[PDB]
Write a protein that binds this ligand. Structure first.
Ligand SMILES: Nc1ncnc2c1ncn2[C@@H]1O[C@@H](COP(=O)(O)CP(=O)(O)OP(=O)(O)O)[C@H](O)[C@H]1O
Ligand SMILES: Nc1ncnc2c1ncn2[C@@H]1O[C@@H](COP(=O)(O)CP(=O)(O)OP(=O)(O)O)[C@H](O)[C@H]1O
Lengths: 530, 530
């Protein structure tokens, strides 16, 4: 439970993100990220690079966004990459049928005049929404007589709407193209040279961190529904018969809420299992898929996602994408309900074959006299956009005080900047201290900034908390005059402080941010300062 | 002088970059960057972030690429952002008139039957190509009777061709849009909130590092002419009356080739002046423009550009962009002649006014009772693409040996990875040494990789040189058996080696890469090893 209104106001005001082309009315689904928003957005991409590319020695490539029609036709995007759209016969307003039907049903379940028996029937309908194909949706749109959410008019029947943007490469119109809806395709088209890097053996993973475009129908979910976002996709090619990851044990003891496809149809709830035990019962097919599922859990957590609001929902029989056979999604409980922030699929061979059969160019690998095989790819799809937004809601808190101050409990690895060095006076009396501390912090690799804003030391930290600065050191007169020279180390979340010698503080803030010492540990070693 | 053919072959083979959608024939102007290409491309963006954003405390924002028609119409891109295109009346092949006329004239100047008097007349025509407007070009295309470079047919008259990509945002066609040709526009549309960050005072600079799209007519310049590239633009807003940068002295003693607009019309050559002296004579208007010009020189140099092939050419009277009044470009002497890699303009007020007058929203600032002024922006435009490619040619060398081996003399700050630790055997005899050195290097922050490839130690380094790895440490038996345990430190460019104790090598390689010690210094302290 989070007050979205209050939050968005803080985010936009401190400029984390805001409506793109605002002075023109803005375009729904498009936002610009201000300074802090970038510092945070950057820290997350940096953490991801470490957690995956670096930790797994993933081959990184950077393909183009512009794509010639022929390429996406083969992958099957020109045909299946779409959403069902409806529009009131009156004017020409469009809506994503998929969601409008869900918005309506939720409206009925809320009305007090609704029977318990119907409430159920509907809950069953919503828990199977991503399965209802073309026809099935048309009927539900009749049975429930869904009508325009605005000036309730009559909606035309649900029709598919290709989400890919369209353009023309070069003068003339002989080469029509689209803006890549995903990045994965680029890695497949380069499978040859890529496989060559690993001596030709499997498994090997290729990755990409770039922009994808999705001409969303009716974006109304803040940063959740954008037509332009940055995503980090991993394409882990493995031998279909050797689907066993040599590191699965490093993430086997992790306990996370799994929501099988069965539990979704068998009407029961998600169970908090153990990955190791998960693979046993057969919930999670193999251990490769299992390994990444665990790593994904670790990443999201380390970046600011709350475990008590993070689950992995499996897909339904016919919910499968036009390129997958099995899949699991990392969903976060937000103010918009459960939403897919990271998508981990298991699109066995499909892709490579399509491009090979179309271009008349072989894309395979061999294994020991020797047999050629079609690699089975597990693609963890990260939406850095939704992932960041989740961190926003999960860490946005309101300080217990009439002034209604807010703050984000951002981990030290993602906060705009870890420490905030703020002195009382800027005269040449404090400089020798501010200068030292700063440079000292830098040597320890702790991002910081010397606060200049006006107001009381308490109002200073008030602005610091808003953008979620992890810590803060107060340098007052007793620090400059008294001796030993000690400063005040203030914790963001607790607001509780400490008084240690200003020379040792750097190493202290370092361990605190790096998770080598607990704030409790600090209060035990040094004298508390009210 | 560089053998482009040989180079491109090495780049593509080691996969620095290559044709996007290769297995489909590829699309001209589109390329994909392989692993090494990314490591290098990343290092350059990282260096730029330090050299500018970090060194100047620039406010970083990240706007959208999709832009609604109304926004670009105001900036004046829907009208002037184009190139003159011609096409042979036979089939429908298009060409950029601007360049075809230049290709033809160069053909004539080469023919031995050309008179000295005409050769001149033409040299004068080419040195004024970016000034010839619509009509002027049509005539030259008649006087010289230019015809299709292929199967020489007849070219239609030169007509403008808008370079901006076109699409449609959202279902329907009520909101037509383009893919931003530049990033600057985004910073202007956010001038309000941005100015607020600096307390409302000037000067203050905003920056952006993102992708821009330019539907180039006929791309045939490798990575020089792309329809999709990453650029880092800086928008330094300053008071029109206070055009004086407080750091100009830090870059005043720099000596760099300046090519005034006069020297371009007065038919003389570029002079290697001193920035300080440059501002005096009035060559470079103010010192703000001068400061960035110096910093730009430093950056390019630090990344791998050769001074003897780097100049700053000023624009011509009517060469000015549709948004500028004065400008200077950093051009690199490549195999394609002189090309603009970094563009530093001085588009005084223009922009902010246009958006304000169109949206009926004021975008100004005040100064001390108080007067509101229209900020004069100096926009340094970096094309990380062309900049990287220049580094390629300027540092690509061929080893003097029949085997025809190649290598790139990449600075330590941009090389894929600084050091290459390569042992002879991988047995548990060397591991205790490889492990230590590696971890030791990491502690010193030196990017490295343990070489595994097969072949002689000399053939191992042969592959290392190709991707331009700065150094390399050889760990042989005398390192494991003999004591003290010393390894071999090999320099890339010189191939000359050294023999120092394997424990001290880390700190040595660190200073070498960080420019704290010269390779000559090393050969003076430690025993040479043949
Ligand atoms: N419009 C959007 N805005 C932000 N991120 C998006 C996005 N569309 C996709 N993503 C990212 O990429 C997604 C990969 O899974 P996809 O199957 O492509 C989502 P989907 O099911 O096709 O659309 P939907 O979840 O809105 O129904 C990640 O879940 C999400 O972070
Ligand atoms: N097609 C392209 N490919 C690579 N970089 C490009 C590019 N177009 C522009 N840039 C980058 O952005 C440029 C900014 O100057 P611009 O005035 O926009 C070039 P221009 O004069 O408009 O086109 P031209 O130099 O090809 O005639 C930098 O010089 C260049 O690095």
């Amino acid at each position: 439970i989070v007050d979205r209104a209050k939050m968005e106001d803080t985010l936009k005001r401190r400029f984390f993100y805001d409506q793109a082309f605002a002075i023109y009315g803005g375009v729904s689904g498009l936002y610009d990220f201000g300074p802090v928003g970038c510092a945070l957005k950057n820290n997350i991409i940096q953490t991801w690079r470490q957690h995956f590319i670096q930790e797994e020695q993933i081959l990184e490539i950077d393909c183009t966004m512009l794509t010639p029609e022929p390429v996406l036709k083969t992958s099957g995007h020109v045909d299946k990459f779409a959403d069902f759209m409806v529009k009131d016969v009156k004017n020409g307003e469009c809506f994503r049928a998929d969601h409008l039907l869900k918005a309506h049903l939720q409206k009925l379940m809320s009305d007090k005049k609704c029977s318990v028996e119907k409430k159920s029937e509907m809950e069953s309908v919503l828990a199977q929404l991503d399965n209802y194909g073309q026809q099935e949706l048309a009927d539900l749109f009749v049975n429930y007589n869904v009508k325009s959410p605005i000036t309730g008019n009559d909606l035309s029947p649900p029709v598919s709407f290709n989400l890919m943007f369209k353009t023309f490469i070069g003068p003339g119109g002989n080469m029509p193209g689209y803006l890549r809806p995903e990045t994965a395709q680029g890695i497949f088209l380069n499978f040859k040279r890529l496989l060559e890097f690993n001596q030709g053996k499997l498994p090997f993973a290729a990755a990409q961190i770039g922009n994808s475009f999705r001409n969303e129908i009716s974006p109304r979910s803040g940063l959740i529904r954008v037509r332009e976002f940055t995503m980090a996709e991993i394409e882990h090619f493995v031998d279909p018969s050797e689907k066993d990851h040599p590191k699965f044990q490093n993430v086997a003891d992790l306990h996370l809420y799994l929501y099988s496809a069965k539990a979704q149809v068998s009407g029961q709830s998600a169970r908090k299992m153990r990955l190791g035990d998960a693979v046993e019962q057969g919930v999670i097919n193999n251990t490769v898929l299992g390994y990444f599922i665990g790593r994904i859990y670790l990443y999201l957590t380390k970046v600011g996602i709350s475990p008590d609001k993070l689950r992995f929902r499996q897909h339904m029989e016919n919910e499968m994408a036009h390129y997958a056979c099995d899949c699991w999604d990392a969903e976060s409980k937000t103010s918009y309900g459960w939403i897919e922030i990271v998508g981990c699929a298991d699109r066995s061979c499909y892709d490579l074959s399509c491009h090979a059969r179309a271009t008349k160019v072989p894309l395979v690998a061999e294994k020991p006299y020797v047999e050629e095989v079609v690699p089975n790819v597990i693609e963890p799809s990260f939406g850095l956009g939704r992932i960041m937004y989740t961190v926003f809601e999960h860490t946005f808190h309101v300080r217990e005080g009439d002034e209604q101050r807010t703050f984000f409990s951002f981990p030290a690895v993602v906060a705009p900047f870890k420490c905030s060095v703020l002195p009382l006076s800027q005269n040449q009396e404090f400089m020798p201290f501010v200068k030292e501390l700063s440079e000292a912090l830098t040597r320890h690799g702790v991002s910081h900034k010397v606060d200049d804003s006006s107001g009381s030391i308490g109002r200073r930290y008030a602005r610091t908390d808003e953008i979620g600065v992890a810590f803060g050191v107060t340098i007052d007169f007793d620090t400059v005059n008294k001796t030993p020279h000690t400063a005040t180390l203030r914790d963001r979340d607790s607001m509780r402080q400490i008084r240690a010698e200003i020379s040792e503080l750097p190493s202290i803030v370092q361990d605190l941010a790096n998770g080598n010492i607990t704030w409790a540990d600090v209060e035990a070693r040094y004298p508390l300062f009210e």
